[PDB]
A paper describes a structure:
The spike (S) protein of [name] plays a crucial role in cell invasion by binding to host receptors, with the transmembrane serine protease [name] recently identified as its protein receptor. The S protein of [name]-B forms a trimeric structure, with each protomer featuring a furin cleavage site “RRKRR”, akin to SARS-CoV-2. S1 comprises four domains: N-terminal lectin-like domain (NTD), RBD, subdomain 1 (SD1), and subdomain 2 (SD2). S2 includes the fusion peptide (FP), the heptad repeat regions 1 (HR1), the central helix (CH), the connector domain (CD), the heptad repeat regions 2 (HR2), the transmembrane domain (TM), and the C-tail domain (CT).
To unravel the mechanism underlying the interaction between the S protein of [name]-B and the host cell receptor [name], we elucidated the cryo-EM structures of the [name]-B S protein incubated with [name] in various conformations, including a closed conformation, two 1up conformations (designated as 1up-1 and 1up-2), two 2up conformations (with or without [name] bound, referred to as 2up-TMR and 2up-1), and a 3up conformation with [name] bound (referred to as 3up-TMR). The sequence identity between the RBDs of [name]-A and [name]-B is 74%, while that between [name]-B and [name]-C reaches 98%, with only sporadic mutations observed at the RL3 site. In the closed conformation of the S protein, these loops engage in interactions with adjacent RBDs and NTDs, stabilizing the structure of the S protein.
Residue numbers in the entry:
A (entry chain B): 51 to 298
B (entry chain A): 1043 to 1221
C (entry chain B): 795 to 1221
D (entry chain A): 646 to 794
E (entry chain A): 299 to 397
Write the structure that this text describes.
Amino acid sequence: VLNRVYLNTTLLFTGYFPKSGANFRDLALKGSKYLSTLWYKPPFLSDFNNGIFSKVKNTKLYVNNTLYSEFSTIVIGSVFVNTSYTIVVQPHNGILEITACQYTMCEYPHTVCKSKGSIRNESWHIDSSEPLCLFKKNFTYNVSADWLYFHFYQERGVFYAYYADVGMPTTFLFSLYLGTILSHYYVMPLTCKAISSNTDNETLEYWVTPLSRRQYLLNFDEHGVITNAVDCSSSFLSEIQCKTQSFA
Amino acid sequence: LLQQLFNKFGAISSSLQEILSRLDPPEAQVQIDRLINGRLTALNAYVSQQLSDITLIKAGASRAIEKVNECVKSQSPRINFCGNGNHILSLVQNAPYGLLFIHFSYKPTSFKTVLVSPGLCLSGDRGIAPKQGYFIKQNDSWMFTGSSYYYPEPISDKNVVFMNSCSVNFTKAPFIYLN
Amino acid sequence: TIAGHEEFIQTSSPKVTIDCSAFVCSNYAACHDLLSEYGTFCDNINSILNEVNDLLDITQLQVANALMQGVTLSSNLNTNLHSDVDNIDFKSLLGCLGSQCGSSSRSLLEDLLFNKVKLSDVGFVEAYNNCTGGSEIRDLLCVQSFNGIKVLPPILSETQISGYTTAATVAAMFPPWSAAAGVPFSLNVQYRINGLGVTMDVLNKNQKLIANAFNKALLSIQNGFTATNSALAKIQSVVNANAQALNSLLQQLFNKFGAISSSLQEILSRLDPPEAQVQIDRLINGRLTALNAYVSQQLSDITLIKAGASRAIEKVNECVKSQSPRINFCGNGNHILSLVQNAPYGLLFIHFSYKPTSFKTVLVSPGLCLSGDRGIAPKQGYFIKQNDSWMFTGSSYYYPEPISDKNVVFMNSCSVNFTKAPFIYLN
Amino acid sequence: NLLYDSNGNIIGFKDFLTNKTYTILPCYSGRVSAAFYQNSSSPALLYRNLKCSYVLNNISFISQPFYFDSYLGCVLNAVNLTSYSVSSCDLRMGSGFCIDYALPSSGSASRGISSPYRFVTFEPFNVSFVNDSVETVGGLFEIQIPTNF
Amino acid sequence: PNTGVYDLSGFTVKPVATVYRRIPNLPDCDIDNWLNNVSVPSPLNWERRIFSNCNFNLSTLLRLVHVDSFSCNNLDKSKIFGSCFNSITVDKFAIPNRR
Ligand SMILES: *[C@@H]1O[C@H](CO)[C@@H](O[C@@H]2O[C@H](CO)[C@@H](O[C@H]3O[C@H](CO[C@H]4O[C@H](CO)[C@@H](O)[C@H](O[C@H]5O[C@H](CO)[C@@H](O)[C@H](O)[C@@H]5O)[C@@H]4O)[C@@H](O)[C@H](O[C@H]4O[C@H](CO)[C@@H](O)[C@H](O)[C@@H]4O)[C@@H]3O)[C@H](O)[C@H]2NC(C)=O)[C@H](O)[C@H]1NC(C)=O
Ligand SMILES: *[C@@H]1O[C@H](CO)[C@@H](O[C@@H]2O[C@H](CO)[C@@H](O)[C@H](O)[C@H]2NC(C)=O)[C@H](O)[C@H]1NC(C)=O
Ligand SMILES: *[C@@H]1O[C@H](CO)[C@@H](O[C@@H]2O[C@H](CO)[C@@H](O)[C@H](O)[C@H]2NC(C)=O)[C@H](O)[C@H]1NC(C)=O
Ligand SMILES: *[C@@H]1O[C@H](CO)[C@@H](O[C@@H]2O[C@H](CO)[C@@H](O)[C@H](O)[C@H]2NC(C)=O)[C@H](O)[C@H]1NC(C)=O
Ligand SMILES: *[C@@H]1O[C@H](CO)[C@@H](O)[C@H](O)[C@H]1NC(C)=O
Ligand SMILES: *[C@@H]1O[C@H](CO)[C@@H](O)[C@H](O)[C@H]1NC(C)=O
Ligand SMILES: *[C@@H]1O[C@H](CO)[C@@H](O)[C@H](O)[C@H]1NC(C)=O
Ligand SMILES: *[C@@H]1O[C@H](CO)[C@@H](O)[C@H](O)[C@H]1NC(C)=O
Ligand SMILES: *[C@@H]1O[C@H](CO)[C@@H](O)[C@H](O)[C@H]1NC(C)=O
Ligand SMILES: *[C@@H]1O[C@H](CO)[C@@H](O)[C@H](O)[C@H]1NC(C)=O
Ligand SMILES: *[C@@H]1O[C@H](CO)[C@@H](O)[C@H](O)[C@H]1NC(C)=O
Ligand SMILES: *[C@@H]1O[C@H](CO)[C@@H](O)[C@H](O)[C@H]1NC(C)=O
Ligand SMILES: *[C@@H]1O[C@H](CO)[C@@H](O)[C@H](O)[C@H]1NC(C)=O
Ligand SMILES: *[C@@H]1O[C@H](CO)[C@@H](O)[C@H](O)[C@H]1NC(C)=O
Ligand SMILES: *[C@@H]1O[C@H](CO)[C@@H](O)[C@H](O)[C@H]1NC(C)=O
Ligand SMILES: *[C@@H]1O[C@H](CO)[C@@H](O)[C@H](O)[C@H]1NC(C)=O
């Protein structure tokens, strides 16, 4: 919660949460030379209704015993043409670059690993005229983290983003007024020379589940850290736990 | 309960006469609804209090019926039920919203300090215990007295209960073969 | 042998008082001006709670009158010297009585009971004494008392009730014998066991075993208040029910009842006195409804408490102070006597009973037909055949003894299924 | 920067300017119990579970010449007389204490001023006492038996 | 009145002092500069500005713009004068005459 601390207690709280018992979908795509057009189809092009929760694997590469962080970039928009705004979240090896601009998006966008670059060039937009932007900001993350977590949602024309790189519960990253409704998101395929099984056996992973407004019971420990949660409408035991406000 | 008719309950007045002589039927109903809700709440509270008081009244009535059956109509062998101990009998009279019981009891007025024994061991290792009384020594002879009035009288079979053995702290008395 | 078991009876409850305008409006001047226009609403709540607490005081005086009615003691009695009669130790039941004691103590059984219940009458006082400071940082009782909800002490302290139960216990041990029917304690035990159908020869031979069984039963009661005792759970249920009711009443101050907020501070810092009164009126109506519901529930619980107190007074009069000829009233049958101890919000009764341990299969007759067509029936026993001779035995202990006039009831005729016995002209 | 409980109240904060941390407690609130006897000019007062130093420093600053601390709290306008005992009382304060009223008569005209209220011990029941022995006098017991009724 | 024990009305300990904390040296919000801007949008493309971490007051604002009317809803004008907020959002557009 916003600027509050809760200490050694349970709390009943309604927020933009995932549904317990639903499914994640691993929408990450790795390529080497060819790009399939079926990758850019409404199996993978999905609906942004209220928002998404994502669990992202931080893939670590080593060149001359030096660490490189890599994961997929995500785009959120409506029609992906230069008469609308798209939000792009892209990593740059410890720097998370977040932009919201009127990009001229390509038909088949992809990104390229920078540590050991691939055959293709990075091409997700072509804009030789510096388009209009509402938001342009760089943040930092832990390069030695195993997982990253993101909340993205919208309400009354405002976009909200939360993230975490140490531990599971996320903290507020930014908000941005748009005045319009976002409708689609897409996880962009990453083209790399060496990630597969004949190489060092690394994988890309980007798990996405939808968000909705619902009530949870949260447990805060002595230091104020969220340690346990229960979705109140997921099972019978969860209904008992939320009517007693107790985890046992 | 009658004082509740002068509360306003958030309305402009507690009087329906003053409301209905100032306002229109659209505007008067908003004021009358508050008085209606307040007075219905007061009646509900009174009704709940009466329903709670009737249970105490029924418990008292069952106790009075028990005292009529077992202290006035007969005399039970229960001690300390009617009166206080040393209770003799009771009479009953009608009273406003109930009954008036008159209890009569035995009351001692003067006393005497006596040395008593709770039982005697007779020859043949037999024992006698006194029945609602004590064994006393008068002129170095064992006699009986009742426990509520001092009156020495001879030990007989109507005063004692016989035992084929005797207790370990009964007083020895081998001279007794009395009436 | 002799078995003992304890039983708790509730006679009182915590006396809750409520400041109605402090619960509804707290501090705020604006809320108080509004509350007045509701007139006589808080006065009825205060009146009903005062009537409930007066009923509690009346029942406590009735219990204390039943404990002390008609007991005469010796002025030379001193519990430091006089705590044992007929090889039975009463030390764990007696408080401190005499002319050199100073009556501010309990017995050690009452000390064992009162140390496992934190919120007794003295626990509430020492908890409210710490509200200026908090004594950790905070407590639920101080938050309740700052919103006008407080538990008051009873009119009699618990050491006074312990002195009353000590007087009632010592009235059965010592040569007035006001509580033991004018006879010594061991003789009274012997006559009560004989009334069940046990001959007096066995009771005269086994007095020391009876005293040892009494000591063992008292020691077994003393080491039994450990986490599964029914009386301890029944005592703790009273405190837990009171704490739950007060916490649920305190939780009503965070309901919105249809208003924009449950806080008067947030309403009065945002709105004007025309617009604020519409919001404050909803909170006032919701909180008055909650207080009415609590007051109705308390008025219903006091009737159950009074019924339990009248039952405890009946057991004090007819099981401890005397022994009634009623069967199955105290205890379970084969009941001998009862003792009483003070308990948090009530009384603890200790019942002693006769318990058979081994048995024997006997062939019995319920009556004999003697010559001249006369009949005899046994008095609380049976007729048995030993060496082809008719003898008597008591119904609760096997001990054959000769048939005499003290064992039988004579009838001028005899029943149709009585056993024929023409050889009997015995003692 | 703000510490909350589960009901939504702020119970602590961190200061922006000094980086110091504090907890917040509510101020004291309570009521007074007035024991009043009819036709008297003022009642006796009881502040329950409060020391008299707190009452004189933090609550009331009017002149109160008579005060003492008792087991129930701070008592104003009464005399401490708990060694005295009474068997009936109409001003019962709890835990075996009572407030008695005794005006100074014409014969007992008190020149030194004091209060007509007295804080005493309430004891409604007693046992009867006899002057007999508790043990055997030569194997016999000593008892009192009535001779008239 | 009769002889009895009476529980009187509840008191509260009166506060001795006042603790007052504010952040110093914050810039001005300058809401009048945005309201008096030359470019005025239509209701079809109405504009929004968010103001936070700044100081404002209503007196200079209501005297520096030419006020025709100023009303408030779920709030009161006199309660704004010493208060702090998380943010203030200001939307503006020009009015067509018949609407
Ligand atoms: C915001 O986004 C929009 C996209 O929605 C951007 O608009 C796009 O701008 C592109 C320019 O960079 C433009 O690409 C092509 O446009 C040129 C004009 O084509 C017309 O004129 C031709 C005259 O020679 C004509 O041949 C052509 O007809 C072809 O296409 C139609 C289908 O459209 C077929 O039916 C015909 O049979 C024929 O094949 C059009 O009528 C075009 O000439 C360019 O192609 C040449 O150049 C290429 C690179 O040099 C080369 O590879 C190619 O072979 C040709 O030689 C050019 O590729 C998009 O058409 C246009 N899209 C829309 C929807 O308007 C907009 O620029 C952007 N804004 C900003 C500020 O970035
Ligand atoms: C966010 O970080 C990225 C990467 O560190 C910055 O992109 C670099 O910008 C400089 C200056 O324009 C270029 O010389 C580099 O070639 C860019 N690197 C890459 C990988 O694109 C970006 O400018 C930063 N954004 C902000 C707002 O500071
Ligand atoms: C209170 O703590 C904050 C840290 O949160 C201090 O702010 C830092 O101040 C130094 C020098 O003024 C800067 O170099 C840091 O970048 C600041 N940190 C942040 C997170 O802004 C602040 O100075 C402290 N105040 C006092 C009085 O000690
Ligand atoms: C009124 O608003 C306009 C925006 O519509 C302001 O114009 C901006 O001015 C700055 C510097 O003069 C430029 O960098 C921006 O590009 C301008 N905005 C646009 C959309 O062109 C203008 O400054 C405002 N007026 C005042 C007095 O502040
Ligand atoms: C944990 O929470 C409980 C409340 O249930 C509290 O009593 C306890 O003090 C807390 N623990 C610590 C270490 O503060
Ligand atoms: C790794 O080391 C080799 C030789 O030491 C060098 O040619 C190469 O450029 C290094 N890699 C990077 C990413 O600098
Ligand atoms: C990538 O870009 C470079 C520089 O423009 C170019 O030389 C190279 O051919 C490009 N790669 C491909 C696969 O077109
Ligand atoms: C986060 O970074 C710190 C140092 O920057 C490091 O000590 C820590 O291990 C990192 N977290 C994880 C999960 O590796
Ligand atoms: C990667 O996996 C293959 C499995 O065929 C294995 O042979 C190889 O040793 C693995 N390499 C590493 C670096 O784990
Ligand atoms: C019998 O009397 C003696 C002395 O009076 C006493 O020590 C003993 O305990 C008594 N025994 C019983 C069973 O009363
Ligand atoms: C009251 O406070 C004292 C000292 O602060 C402490 O020893 C005692 O246990 C407290 N009592 C209660 C009931 O909290
Ligand atoms: C004292 O009180 C009684 C109330 O019964 C009243 O009748 C009497 O007048 C009072 N005395 C004086 C002097 O007012
Ligand atoms: C009140 O008097 C009693 C003796 O009657 C004494 O023990 C007690 O300490 C006194 N209290 C105060 C506060 O002086
Ligand atoms: C015992 O209480 C009665 C109550 O009327 C009283 O008369 C008597 O003086 C008291 N006796 C002692 C010794 O306190
Ligand atoms: C009565 O008790 C007193 C104790 O003060 C004693 O001195 C006196 O001898 C006793 N009298 C009798 C007859 O026992
Ligand atoms: C009993 O008392 C009455 C009146 O007090 C008296 O007339 C009578 O003689 C007394 N009887 C005896 C036996 O003392």
